[PDB]
């Protein structure tokens, strides 16, 4: 459910860096490589936005 915020290995904040991420791999014709434009030189955490599942859009639609 939603980006982890703070990568698992370092501290590099990733809560901020997704509302902007998704607006490239599906909205700018840049590669998975495009995240490099977000200051992701380390492995590391950058496999954080990448290996992530958006499990809330598909959970939020159960309205009580």
């Amino acid at each position: 459910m939603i980006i982890p915020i703070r990568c698992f290995s370092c501290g590099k904040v990733i809560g901020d860096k997704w509302d902007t991420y998704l607006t490239l791999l599906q909205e700018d014709n840049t590669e998975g490589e495009a995240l490099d434009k977000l200051g992701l030189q380390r492995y590391c955490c950058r496999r954080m936005i990448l290996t992530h599942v958006d499990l809330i859009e598909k959970l939020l639609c159960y309205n009580p």
């Binding site: 982890p4 703070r6 990568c7 698992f8 290995s9």
Partner: protein, 134 residues
């Protein structure tokens, strides 16, 4: 060593393999009789018999708990009663295994048929990685 691993605490602190453990307690309302009632009334230490190490201090006027009350220990969550001065109220209510803890997700009170009341309680209990997990 020998088929075993050491993990970084910094990570488990930010959420490595953090999991949740919902458990749910089912309970209906049998009625044999004749006409023997057995409501989810809050046990009254004035003519019960018998049940100690409560505490029932965590039950509402409804005899059921309200999410998300920090429940731990052998705390109790529902209350029963079965007829037989000051007589007579029994206690067929279900406690909570001490081995578990944590708060209470939500409870659902419906009707069975049967023909009485029917409650279900679910409590959540975050579980972090600790030495000895697989």
């Amino acid at each position: 060593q020998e088929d075993s691993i050491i993990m970084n605490q910094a990570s488990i602190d930010r959420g490595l393999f953090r999991s949740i453990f919902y458990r749910t307690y089912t309970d209906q309302e049998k009625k044999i009789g004749m006409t023997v009632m057995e409501e989810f009334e809050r046990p009254v230490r004035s003519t019960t018999l018998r049940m100690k190490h409560g505490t029932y201090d965590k039950l509402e006027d409804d005899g059921l708990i309200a999410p998300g009350t920090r429940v731990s220990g052998e705390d109790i969550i529902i209350g029963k009663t079965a007829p037989i001065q000051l007589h007579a109220k029994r206690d067929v209510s279900t406690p909570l295994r001490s081995t578990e803890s944590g708060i209470v997700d939500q409870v659902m009170v419906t009707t069975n048929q049967e023909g009485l009341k029917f409650v279900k309680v679910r409590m959540r209990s975050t579980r972090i990685p600790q030495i000895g997990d697989k």
